[PDB]
């Protein structure tokens, strides 16, 4: 995996790859690494697929129960903390999970990094998985708060592409999301094979690659 997410003026972008490996064998070309918890809440997945799916789908149960009890949507801060506390029960037992809880609440857009150790960090920009270093390179040099929705979607898409190219354990396709105060919006599945050649020609990047 490579996953990323960042806050900006018009909400938060979420971009992930779709590759799944079992050693050096590519077990899946197209795996959904985002989870729709609620129209205003998203969760990314990196690490053990089973752990990511089970615990974040269990978070959704607990986030849903919050709505029924209080007649109000759970905050991103509270949702991330519930998840971190779950990880803390199975302390040292061998869970492998790295996720970003992305959403919009009363404080505005929210983004929290959460992992198997129980770490819970608030921040503007995060990237997880084996290819995060490649993604950070593109993000750090091109990120601004003043980004347009169109340019921001491209940045997250381009950042995953950078990782998919270099990292052997990242690739397949790119899944894009955009989180607004009216909820999250899916911006499609983009094959890296096609996207790479397209970006190469249009952007002029990847000069060293022949095509």
């Amino acid at each position: 995996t490579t996953t990323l997410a960042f806050k900006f003026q018009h909400g938060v972008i979420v971009a992930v790859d779709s590759r799944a490996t079992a050693g050096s064998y590519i077990s899946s070309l197209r795996m959904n690494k985002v989870i729709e918890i609620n129209p205003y809440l998203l969760g990314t997945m990196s690490g053990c697929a089973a752990d990511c799916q089970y615990w974040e789908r269990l978070l959704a149960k607990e986030c849903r129960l919050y709505y029924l009890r209080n007649g109000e949507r759970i905050s991103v801060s509270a949702a991330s903390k519930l998840l971190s506390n779950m990880m803390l029960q199975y302390r040292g037992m061998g869970l492998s999970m790295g996720s970003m809880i992305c959403g919009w609440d009363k404080k505005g857009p929210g983004l929290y990094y959460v992992d198997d150790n129980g770490t819970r960090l608030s921040g503007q920009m995060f990237s997880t998985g084996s290819g995060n270093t490649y993604a950070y390179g593109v993000l750090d040099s091109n990120y601004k708060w003043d980004l347009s929705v169109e340019d921001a979607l491209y940045l997250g898409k381009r950042s995953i592409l950078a990782a998919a190219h270099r990292d052997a354990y990242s690739g397949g396709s790119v899944n894009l999301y955009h989180v607004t105060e009216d909820g999250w919006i899916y911006h499609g599945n983009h094959d890296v094979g096609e996207l790479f050649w397209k970006v190469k020609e249009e952007e002029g990047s990847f000069n060293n690659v022949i095509g």
Binding site: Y25, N32, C48, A49, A50, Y54
Partner: protein
């Protein structure tokens, strides 16, 4: 030291059609270099138009199938004989597998059937319960041999239209049940040639709105 796990070999294959689905698997059961059985069924009709196969460690595979079949029975009792949809079965199986997160069912599981719109459906599981709906999936010993072939011959990967030279892809036309069964048989015949744990026989379960049908084919016994 006691090793509670073992490897019974075998290979399974699930393909989702437009209005049908197939779940195939070889009938050979093995330990190390010995053949236990040349015909030991691996794909099962679990009721409600769902078929399932748990490949890997046979004892854990049999246990999981047994528990899911049981889960189907209790779903009828508890919810007024309601039909268990394929998506609901898949989620139920995730929770069956994750019960043993720290002492897993050592199996790669596949189920097949029809979704609530009547279209073909295949779901894939890892030993600890991560699952996803798929069009095509091979599991087990010879999974790495078969999957690339299906990427090419089912989803037409790396295939383009002559004359255009890489500009226009081969269009993703749907496959018939007769066409799918040909790809399944050729997949297992090829796997049998190059993998020692694959052979003896091939049993295919085909699922349509009419029900669950079986087909059997001999494989090389060496």
């Amino acid at each position: 030291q006691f090793n509670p796990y073992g490897d019974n070999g075998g290979t399974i294959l699930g393909i989702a059609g437009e209005d049908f689905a197939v779940l195939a698997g070889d009938t050979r059961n093995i330990t190390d270099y010995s053949i236990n059985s040349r015909y030991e069924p691996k794909v099962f009709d679990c009721g409600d138009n769902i078929v399932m196969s748990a490949n890997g460690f046979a004892a854990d595979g049999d246990a999981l199938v047994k528990r899911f079949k049981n889960s189907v029975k209790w779903y009828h009792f508890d919810h007024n004989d309601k039909k268990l949809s394929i998506n609901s079965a898949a989620r139920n199986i995730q929770h069956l597998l994750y019960s043993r997160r720290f002492f897993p069912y050592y199996v790669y599981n596949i189920i097949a059937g029809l979704d609530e719109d009547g279209k073909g459906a295949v779901y894939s599981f890892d030993p600890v319960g991560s699952y996803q709906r798929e069009q095509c999936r091979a599991g087990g010993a010879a999974a790495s041999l078969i999957m690339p072939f299906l990427d090419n011959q089912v989803n037409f990967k790396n295939q383009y239209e002559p004359g255009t030279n890489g500009k226009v892809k081969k269009p993703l036309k749907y496959l018939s049940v007769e066409e799918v069964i040909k790809l399944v048989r050729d997949s297992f015949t090829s796997a049998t040639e190059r993998h020692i744990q694959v052979g003896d026989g091939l049993e295919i379960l085909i699922v349509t709105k009419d029900g669950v049908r079986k087909e059997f084919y001999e494989l090389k016994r060496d």
